[PDB]
Design an enzyme around this catalytic site. Structure first.
Site, short mmCIF file in Angstrom:
data_model
loop_
_atom_site.label_atom_id
_atom_site.label_comp_id
_atom_site.label_asym_id
_atom_site.label_seq_id
_atom_site.Cartn_x
_atom_site.Cartn_y
_atom_site.Cartn_z
CE1 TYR A 1 -3.04 -6.21 -0.13
CE2 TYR A 1 -5.01 -5.01 0.50
CZ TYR A 1 -3.68 -5.33 0.72
OH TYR A 1 -3.02 -4.77 1.80
C1 F43 Z 1 -4.46 1.53 1.33
C2 F43 Z 1 -5.02 0.45 2.27
C3 F43 Z 1 -6.24 -0.21 1.61
C4 F43 Z 1 -5.64 -1.41 0.93
O1 F43 Z 1 -6.10 -2.01 -0.04
N1 F43 Z 1 -4.50 -1.73 1.56
C5 F43 Z 1 -4.05 -0.73 2.54
C6 F43 Z 1 -2.54 -0.43 2.40
C7 F43 Z 1 -1.67 -1.68 2.32
C8 F43 Z 1 -0.16 -1.52 2.04
C9 F43 Z 1 0.40 -0.35 2.85
C10 F43 Z 1 1.83 0.03 2.46
C11 F43 Z 1 2.06 1.51 2.36
O2 F43 Z 1 1.70 2.17 3.43
O3 F43 Z 1 2.60 2.02 1.41
C12 F43 Z 1 0.26 -2.94 2.48
C13 F43 Z 1 1.67 -2.99 3.10
C14 F43 Z 1 0.20 -3.95 1.31
C15 F43 Z 1 1.25 -3.68 0.25
N2 F43 Z 1 0.84 -3.05 -0.84
O4 F43 Z 1 2.42 -4.06 0.40
C16 F43 Z 1 -0.76 -3.29 3.55
N3 F43 Z 1 -1.77 -2.51 3.55
NI1 F43 Z 1 -3.13 -2.39 5.14
N4 F43 Z 1 -1.83 -3.33 6.40
C17 F43 Z 1 -1.96 -3.71 7.68
C18 F43 Z 1 -3.04 -3.36 8.51
C19 F43 Z 1 -4.00 -2.42 8.14
C20 F43 Z 1 -4.99 -1.85 9.12
C21 F43 Z 1 -4.25 -0.76 9.92
C22 F43 Z 1 -5.13 -0.01 10.95
C23 F43 Z 1 -4.40 0.78 12.01
O5 F43 Z 1 -4.95 1.19 13.01
O6 F43 Z 1 -3.14 1.03 11.74
C24 F43 Z 1 -6.02 -1.18 8.17
C25 F43 Z 1 -7.33 -1.96 8.03
C26 F43 Z 1 -8.21 -1.83 9.25
O7 F43 Z 1 -8.43 -0.76 9.77
O8 F43 Z 1 -8.37 -2.97 9.88
C27 F43 Z 1 -5.25 -1.17 6.88
C28 F43 Z 1 -5.63 -0.38 5.84
C29 F43 Z 1 -5.09 -0.26 4.54
N5 F43 Z 1 -4.30 -1.12 3.97
C30 F43 Z 1 -5.39 0.98 3.70
C31 F43 Z 1 -4.59 2.21 4.15
C32 F43 Z 1 -4.84 2.61 5.60
C33 F43 Z 1 -4.46 4.04 5.88
O9 F43 Z 1 -4.73 4.95 5.13
O10 F43 Z 1 -3.61 4.17 6.87
N6 F43 Z 1 -4.29 -2.13 6.83
C34 F43 Z 1 -3.10 -3.96 9.85
O11 F43 Z 1 -4.12 -4.00 10.52
C35 F43 Z 1 -1.83 -4.55 10.39
C36 F43 Z 1 -0.94 -5.18 9.32
C37 F43 Z 1 -0.62 -4.17 8.21
C38 F43 Z 1 -0.02 -4.81 6.96
C39 F43 Z 1 1.51 -4.72 7.00
C40 F43 Z 1 2.19 -5.80 7.80
O12 F43 Z 1 1.49 -6.90 7.89
O13 F43 Z 1 3.30 -5.68 8.28
C41 F43 Z 1 -0.51 -3.78 5.93
C42 F43 Z 1 -0.60 -4.37 4.52
C1 LIG Z 2 -9.03 -12.13 -5.81
C2 LIG Z 2 -8.03 -12.52 -6.90
O1 LIG Z 2 -7.64 -11.37 -7.64
P1 LIG Z 2 -8.33 -11.01 -9.04
O2 LIG Z 2 -9.82 -10.44 -8.79
O3 LIG Z 2 -8.43 -12.35 -9.93
O4 LIG Z 2 -7.50 -9.98 -9.71
C3 LIG Z 2 -6.78 -13.15 -6.29
N1 LIG Z 2 -6.09 -12.25 -5.37
C4 LIG Z 2 -6.09 -12.47 -4.04
O5 LIG Z 2 -6.71 -13.40 -3.56
C5 LIG Z 2 -5.31 -11.53 -3.16
C6 LIG Z 2 -4.92 -12.31 -1.90
C7 LIG Z 2 -3.74 -11.66 -1.16
C8 LIG Z 2 -4.00 -10.18 -0.84
C9 LIG Z 2 -5.17 -10.00 0.14
C10 LIG Z 2 -4.80 -10.56 1.52
S1 LIG Z 2 -6.14 -10.25 2.70
C11 LIG Z 2 -5.75 -13.50 -7.34
O6 LIG Z 2 -4.77 -12.62 -7.61
O7 LIG Z 2 -5.79 -14.55 -7.94
O1 LIG Z 3 -7.98 -1.44 4.22
S1 LIG Z 3 -8.22 -2.82 3.68
O2 LIG Z 3 -9.08 -3.61 4.62
O3 LIG Z 3 -8.91 -2.68 2.33
C1 LIG Z 3 -6.66 -3.68 3.44
C2 LIG Z 3 -5.97 -3.96 4.78
S2 LIG Z 3 -4.26 -4.49 4.54
#
Ligand code: F43
Ligand SMILES: C[C@@H](OP(=O)(O)O)[C@H](NC(=O)CCCCCCS)C(=O)O
Ligand SMILES: O=S(=O)(O)CCS
Ligand SMILES: O=S(=O)(O)CCS
Ligand SMILES: [Mg+2]
Ligand SMILES: [Mg+2]
Ligand SMILES: [Mg+2]
Ligand SMILES: [Mg+2]
Ligand SMILES: [Mg+2]
Lengths: 548, 442, 246, 548, 110
Positions: B366
């Protein structure tokens, strides 16, 4: 041969263009106009449906005591009322801005190093092609890793995709050609060789996020959206942990280290993030316009296509809406791309330079400026004096100043091959114009023009800058219509005369040489006309998720 | 003095230097060496003459991948650097024999420039340094080669970049430790918008000197922000002394005791032991097989806890010789100590909170990045008021080569030019000596 | 050290996991080679890739802290930093995410530990990660039905169990053999198929799970009934609040 | 009686909600879902048409190894798949943001002084009504003074208009009611009297510029667009010179001196101009939501309608696109407004408070926080322990933390009548949650929550602020999902319990009590459902100017 | 007294605090001066005007010697007066955040 603007004038008025007298007040006011009539009826329906009065021809002064003119879109035979060239009423000019706003250029050179050095894995055209297949699934808003993800409707985001380019032909030919901008196919040989040398072995992505997202949100969304889905696709295609320390290098690379924004952010008084019109420098705008790679044999046509791109974006959308709004600045802009007027003045100047110096052979000094800029200025102003219909056409002084000075400035740059002397000629034109007719533009038109001469060659902190690097945030330029799009033309002019493939950034030039764009940047003025006729199909509509 | 506290000062090898020094002898408001460092940072500019010359030769100006064909200028700037530097100095200086300084480095390839202090006495902020330096070098180059009016604007572009179309000096060939005032997250943040990598570069990766410079900058910023005013002044002074200046040798000793085999948990045990012995904490209450600790001096508990936090970073990330885990140490040191003692963690939870986001934004898609690109002005790591960032500096100082965005990648020009200034490279030596010299005036 | 307050089995188990003196019960034997295959970073027999030279070849600067902190073996060698990641079911898995991170930084050197609700990860130098990973897989940190090794697609910690009592897994990396009552790992942690599966042993029974778990639940030991633990948390909240104000 | 979430759980799963075991892997992956099937076929058509691969179910991991659940939009009987609640796919969520973005409040109090004192003219209800008739012609983009102006198409800009309101009942009755937001008709009697006392004799305009302009441009356009057409309408209706010195006082009044932006600009790292989501404080968002003037008898319903408004805007559009993008954060947000889960937890807490203390009668101190927030936290967590189906519903820890803490914090504020102690209870809930289940949220979920307790009552520069004044730019809050919308609910909660007519700004409250808005701000959750069913009709489409 | 904090027309009902600040201005100013100064005979200056309705504050030069820019003046002044007002009337932890909002407004949301 006639002047290029004569046909337009014969269509607008029943008199001969040389006649000094006409008749007014008998035309029916707004009823003379098919478009004003459509507006009157629409305003009645709207007011009845919502219970609040709206458009009403009887408010204020009565339009149409003179002739309400059609306009010829220059280089076309299309004639439209000016209301059809208002950006609100023209889907083509809205999409041209959307296609810029939603674009970013992101390198893959740092990302590939992280893969090889930090993760210790190999990068080949095969893994690149797999990555590109993955990111073209993910970038419009679809999932690749997590379970129970909800996704964007593919048909709502059909305009979003990622392509790559590289100066290395052999690497380019091993990537799946669906994903590749082929420099050799899009550019003539001399231009392709220049461009490929600038890029070298680097590999660059062109990312376009969905128009519907760009319209819901803002320009600063683009590089973030791009980075998120690049990151997900790198995780998937190269088998990282889905979120380890190395993941962060990819985010920094995609968001900051190898990203090229189209516009830089703006200071607080006119606070805006990246990829808004005010941050786009004149050199980028000229390079976004793709006339240079199809019309390279005619530097006038190339330079004026850039003027049209810029006059629309900078005066109509940026200054006329982002920075003000309301009825706006349609005709301040159309003056530079209708009736073949600016074309006539600039073809005259190119021929004068061709005959006396030869393109790009004049000395780059004040003597050339005083010669070319004066001659072309006097030519332009004499046309208004010899043809009263032309003066009634471009009725505002600002309009006339921008057109005459654009021709003088472009013509001077044709002679010297240097945009800075071209800029000096623009300001000299204004000074001569002011003294000839004892008027110039609107109340605040020549703020930058009076500061202009001294700041062309200044080197001081917030004064000195080559024209190609200037833009709508250069201090003197930040407020006023009738300059910015014309400056973009002057930036293009010496490079079109020299045959340069690009004005300021070769990656920007390549990034818009793409047939999958919605707006056709090779023919900007033809697209404006198509939008004026309501024949343009934009992206980003919501018909699919709304009732019949 | 306003406070009764006194501290024993040590050097970076663990040796005593001066005993029982009043706490306020370390205060940014009183210590003259901190004043010297802060003013030196404000007024020091690095100029890259090799880069100016290459940009002009290729007409590559105004930002990444930008080039204006037909504007190339072939000038021998490095080969005439001595004459250019001298002409620039006469324009930069206010009077002969003031504190202006212009030194060439690398055979004329770089220039260290220290703008005279007098220019900042009649300035509101700090941009006079880059802007005065930039225009003096632009004018000197034009005069050296008789660059024409028609061409001189390319020299301007080569030095200061796309400014003022860009708000920043985009593509500039000058560098400072400070960034432009517009990029501050809030008023008073300027001394916090210095990248950790810059601090590590200027101190040549000496762990205790990087920690000291970072702590000086962070805690001096807390005065400018008004955070270290009134009821909070003592907390911030004690944090500066114990976390950043090795007061009472507490950090050094904790690392000595735990460096061969220690973990974060073992540093915590020793710190709690020492705090109990020194009387900082006392047993307040007994539960079932669990002692609840209390304290009559929260600011001193915080300072002790913050010294252990430094040591834990040194021990954990020093063992891995890898900086990335500093975000974990900052989190779980504080999480563990709270359930070990019943007392609040450093900065009353704010270091733990900063570490949570800092972990996420250094291991996810992110934003953020590696540890060295963070700073106290970064939205991710601005929340703790001086107690987190110095640990990042220490951890990057200990990194053996695991980062792609290392100080060599982001801060080479800082390394080469700013490390030359003695007070920037070894701030701990000068701050401690200056504190001894004023101990009886406080 | 006391590590954690409370008088439940849960609290004691949380203390034991953190306590480096407490001997983790070994429940299964895994070969060094099979650890490498589960991790998936390199092939057995392959040499450790390097990200920087050995420390002895660098000649790094005079620094009393460097002299005083002994690097781990992988840092001396210049190893990559790689990872192992676990998902723990909320239906009485022995270890749980914050328990892991807290315990790792009491037990192991040079550790980068991260806690999430559905994943918990540790990153360190490659050869040291392999020694740590064996203990994390062989001991009571791990149950092959209620815990999983997953580098991606971690969904499951909060889902209902399948009819065999296995945690959900998108990628079905761990397979229960109904005809033998043993769990085999058939893919590495990122989801690639293994040449030969690895036996992970028998799932613990629910009675033993309840005895070893570190999660509070109404159908086990509820947090609200561990009043000494609750009291300490409320105290930290109060003292943080007061500290922030004055 | 059953818990409020039971019906939703029974419709999602074949098992009964209490059962601990189910079967996976035999649902057919994406084929179980009608919506995923629609997406697969659209992706094939898009790929074929444009020549670049796009959505492909075989990229990445195979979605749908578990049940892909429908969601009940809380307070409705509408069940939809989660993709129908993605903001890209839901025209009601897009229009909600457009209606906020395109709105500004502009006083007429300075303007009328300039008229009376500088110009020496009279202001009467009669001249005001004439001005309002003029500005409702001008505001959508139509001319009142100059000859040969080109104008916006009234049907494209039908959603733009200007209304006024005032606390002076006599002036309000003199003005044509088409232009008037009648406080007495739109608000219950007790609320109307409070609001009228705040506004007094001041007269304020609610300006709404066209959606099509807001989507083409940005939020910082709104106050500028508004000011230009106010200026032209003042020139026209009060017979100034069309551009004299006094014209400048009106421009300064309307652009700066008596303007209320919906959001303030943001610092450079997240550079944005005015009227973007990050600038909207939580107090404003609660006041934009109109639940308080229809559902005032139920303070839970009012508070949770605010949560829904904020969860969508702040998490899905702001954090999930403006500040990141891609697949985004739909379900981080839907956890707060689906399946009646948060409603159950919060109705329980309201009953606890009302029985033990009475609403707003609890001491405003830390004893009340430790009591209410602990009890409600334990109740919510226990529901996930007793109902395995509920835990599989809200499968991410972040989701559960936000819902439980929102109930705890709102309930604490119901007890104390003060939002700052409500905020303390939010953070205590987090700490208890984390220790109960040895987990909380995603990697960076509790940055603000660990900073939280100490910054509730701090008074230092960038730490101390009443919750109502905080917003998405409050430093600790600027980055992460699962907090901002819930904070807006806690801001609303004590004011709902007290019966207050507004939370933070009465002018904002009144400005959205307007039946000519496109989105119905009295029933936020009902509107989200209508958009999910593809039955919401947005403004700003370009169908009228595009081909068939 | 009105809970009108945070910008034009803003008000938080139920947060009103009634403190006699002007009537105790001399004591508040003295307490704030002790926090703003660096030493007892530096160039700190705090003077009451209009009979305590207004104060002229000149933050000591020494604070700007070790500052990057000029924001120390409002920030140090605001916190000293916030703390001085809290201490004068023993304003509780629960209410003090309103004094902060009255002095410095909507910062840092704005
Ligand atoms: C790659 C990451 C690390 C990162 O920076 N973001 C990810 C992935 C990212 C992608 C996943 C899309 C895709 O699958 O292609 C998106 C949708 C953000 C995007 N780029 O649009 C997202 N997560 Ni994440 N992500 C979420 C969540 C989660 C929960 C899921 C845990 C479980 O048991 O399923 C965990 C974090 C944790 O354990 O708390 C999680 C991890 C992760 N999150 C792990 C991948 C996990 C894995 O390998 O399966 N998210 C959630 O906890 C619910 C909401 C969900 C978001 C999508 C939505 O809001 O509809 C999504 C939000
Ligand atoms: C931290 C900062 O990113 P940079 O370190 O400046 O690249 C900032 N992003 C964010 O805050 C990402 C917020 C939304 C995604 C995470 C949701 S938990 C921004 O783009 O201005
Ligand atoms: O798996 S991470 O906590 O880094 C992002 C969740 S959407
Ligand atoms: O009359 S003015 O010059 O002020 C405006 C021209 S649009
Ligand atoms: Mg002639
Ligand atoms: Mg085409
Ligand atoms: Mg000793
Ligand atoms: Mg063995
Ligand atoms: Mg309706």
């Amino acid at each position: 041969a006639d002047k290029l603007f004569i046909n337009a004038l014969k269509k607008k008025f029943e008199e001969s263009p040389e006649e000094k007298k006409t008749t007014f007040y008998t035309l029916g006011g707004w009823k003379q106009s098919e478009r004003k009539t459509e507006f009157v009826n629409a305003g009645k329906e709207v007011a009845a449906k919502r219970g609040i009065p709206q458009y009403n021809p009887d408010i204020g002064t009565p339009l149409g005591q003179r002739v309400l003119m059609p306009y010829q879109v220059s280089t076309t035979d299309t004639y439209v009322e000016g209301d059809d060239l208002h950006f609100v009423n023209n889907a083509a000019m809205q999409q041209m801005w959307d296609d810029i706003r939603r674009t970013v250029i992101v390198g893959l050179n740092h990302a590939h190093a992280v893969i090889e050095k930090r993760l210790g894995k190999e990068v080949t055209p095969e893994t690149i092609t797999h990555y590109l297949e993955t990111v073209n699934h993910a970038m419009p808003g679809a999932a690749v890793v997590q379970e129970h993800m909800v996704e964007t409707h593919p048909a709502l985001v059909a305009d979003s995709y990622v392509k790559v380019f590289t100066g290395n032909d052999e690497i380019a030919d091993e990537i799946d050609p669906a994903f590749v901008i082929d420099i050799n196919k899009q550019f003539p040989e001399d231009q392709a060789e220049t461009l490929k040398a600038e890029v070298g072995d680097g590999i660059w992505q062109v990312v376009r996020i969905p128009t519907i997202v760009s319209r819901t949100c803002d320009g600063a969304t683009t590089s973030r959206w791009s980075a998120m889905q690049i990151g997900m696709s790198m995780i998937s295609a190269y088998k990282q942990a889905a979120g380890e320390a190395a993941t962060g290098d990819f985010a920094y690379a995609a968001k900051h280290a190898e990203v090229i924004h189209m516009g830089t952010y703006l200071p607080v008084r006119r606070a805006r993030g990246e990829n808004e019109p005010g941050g786009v420098p004149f050199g980028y705008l000229a390079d976004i316009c793709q006339s240079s790679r199809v019309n390279y044999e005619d530097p006038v046509r190339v330079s004026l296509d850039v003027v049209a791109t810029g006059a629309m974006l900078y005066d109509q959308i940026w200054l006329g809406s982002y920075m003000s709004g309301g009825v706006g600045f349609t005709q301040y802009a159309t003056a530079a791309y209708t009736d073949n007027i600016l074309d006539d003045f600039t073809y005259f100047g190119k021929e004068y330079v061709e005959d006396k110096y030869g393109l790009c052979e004049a000395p780059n000094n004040m003597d050339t400026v005083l010669d070319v800029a004066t001659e072309v200025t006097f030519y332009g102003l004499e046309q208004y004096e010899e043809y009263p219909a032309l003066l009634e056409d471009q009725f505002g002084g600002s309009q006339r100043a921008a057109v005459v000075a654009a021709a003088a400035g472009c013509s001077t740059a044709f002679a010297t091959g240097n945009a800075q002397t071209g800029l000096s000629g623009w300001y000299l034109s204004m000074y001569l114009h002011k003294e000839q007719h004892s008027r110039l533009g609107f109340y605040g038109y020549d703020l930058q023009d009076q500061c202009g001469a001294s700041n062309v060659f200044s080197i001081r902190g917030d004064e000195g800058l080559p024209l190609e690097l200037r833009g709508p945030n250069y201090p003197n330029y930040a407020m006023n219509v009738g300059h910015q799009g014309e400056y973009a033309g002057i930036s293009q002019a010496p490079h079109a005369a020299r045959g340069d493939a690009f004005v300021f950034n070769p990656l920007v030039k390549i990034a818009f040489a793409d047939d999958n764009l919605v707006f056709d940047f090779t023919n900007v003025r033809g697209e404006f006309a198509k939008g004026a006729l309501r024949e343009f199909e934009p992206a980003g509509e919501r018909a699919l998720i709304t009732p019949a | 003095a306003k406070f009764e506290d006194k501290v024993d000062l040590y050097d970076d090898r663990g040796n005593l230097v001066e005993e029982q020094v009043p706490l306020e002898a370390l205060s940014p408001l009183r210590n003259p060496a901190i004043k010297s460092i802060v003013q030196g940072i404000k007024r020091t500019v690095a100029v890259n003459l090799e880069g100016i010359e290459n940009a002009l030769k290729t007409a590559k100006v105004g930002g990444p991948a930008c080039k204006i064909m037909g504007r190339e200028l072939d000038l021998d700037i490095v080969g005439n650097a001595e004459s250019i530097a001298a002409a620039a100095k006469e324009m930069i200086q206010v009077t002969e024999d003031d504190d202006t300084n212009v030194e060439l480095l690398g055979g004329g390839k770089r220039a260290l420039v220290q703008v005279p202090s007098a220019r900042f006495d009649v300035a509101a902020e700090y941009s006079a340094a880059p802007l005065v330096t930039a225009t003096a070098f632009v004018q000197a180059i034009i005069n050296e080669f008789d660059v024409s009016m028609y061409d001189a604007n390319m020299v301007k572009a080569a030095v200061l970049g796309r400014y003022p179309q860009s708000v920043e000096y985009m593509g500039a060939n000058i560098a400072t430790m400070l960034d432009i005032p517009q990029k501050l997250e809030g008023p008073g943040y300027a001394l916090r918008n210095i990248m950790v990598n810059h601090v590590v570069a200027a101190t040549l990766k000496n762990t205790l000197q990087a920690a000291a410079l970072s702590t000086i900058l962070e805690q001096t910023a807390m005065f400018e922000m008004g955070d270290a005013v009134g009821a909070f002044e003592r907390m911030h002074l004690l944090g500066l002394a114990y976390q950043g200046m090795n007061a009472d040798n507490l950090v050094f000793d904790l690392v000595k005791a735990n460096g061969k085999e220690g973990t974060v948990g073992s540093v915590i045990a020793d710190l709690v032991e020492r705090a109990l012995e020194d009387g900082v904490i006392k047993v307040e209450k007994e539960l079932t097989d669990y002692k609840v600790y209390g304290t009559d001096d929260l600011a001193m508990w915080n300072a002790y806890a913050a010294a252990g936090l430094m040591a834990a970073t040194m021990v954990n990330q020093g063992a891995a010789r890898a900086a990335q885990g500093v975000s974990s140490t900052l989190l779980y040191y504080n999480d563990l100590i709270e359930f070990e003692t019943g007392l609040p963690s450093v900065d009353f939870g704010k270091v733990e909170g900063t570490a949570v986001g800092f972990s996420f934004f250094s291991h996810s898609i992110y934003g953020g990045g590696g540890p060295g690109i963070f700073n106290g002005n970064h939205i991710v790591t601005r929340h703790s008021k001086g107690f987190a960032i110095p640990c990042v500096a220490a951890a990057m100082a200990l990194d053996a080569g695991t980062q792609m965005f290392s100080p060599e990648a982001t801060s080479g020009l800082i390394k080469e030019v700013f490390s030359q200034v003695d007070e920037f490279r070894e701030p701990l030596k000068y701050v401690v000596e200056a504190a001894a010299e004023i101990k009886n005036e406080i | 050290a006391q590590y954690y307050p409370g008088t439940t089995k849960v609290a004691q188990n949380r203390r034991n996991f953190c306590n480096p003196e407490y001997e983790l019960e070994k429940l299964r034997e895994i070969s060094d080679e099979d650890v490498v295959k589960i991790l998936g970073h390199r092939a057995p027999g392959e040499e450790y890739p390097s990200v920087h030279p050995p420390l002895e070849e660098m000649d790094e600067p005079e620094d009393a802290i460097r002299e005083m902190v002994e690097p781990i073996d992988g840092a001396k060698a210049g190893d990559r930093v790689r990872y192992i990641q676990f998902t723990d079911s909320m239906y009485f898995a022995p270890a749980q995410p914050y328990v892991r991170s807290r315990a790792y930084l009491c037990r192991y050197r040079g550790a980068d530990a991260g806690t999430l609700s559905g994943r918990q990860i540790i990153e360190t130098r490659e050869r040291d990660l392999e020694k740590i990973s064996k203990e994390l897989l062989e001991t009571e940190f791990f149950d092959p039905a209620r815990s999983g090794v997953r580098g991606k697609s971690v969904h499951g910690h909060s889902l209902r169990l399948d009819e065999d009592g296995m945690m959900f897994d998108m990628l079905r990396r761990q397979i229960y053999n109904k005809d033998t009552g043993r769990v085999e790992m058939v893919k590495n942690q990122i989801g690639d198929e293994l040449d030969e599966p690895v036996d992970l042993g028998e799932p613990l029974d629910e009675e033993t799970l309840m005895e070893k778990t570190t999660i509070y639940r109404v159908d086990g030991e509820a947090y609200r009934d561990d009043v000494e633990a609750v009291e300490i948390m409320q105290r930290i909240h109060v003292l943080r609040s007061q500290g922030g104000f004055n």
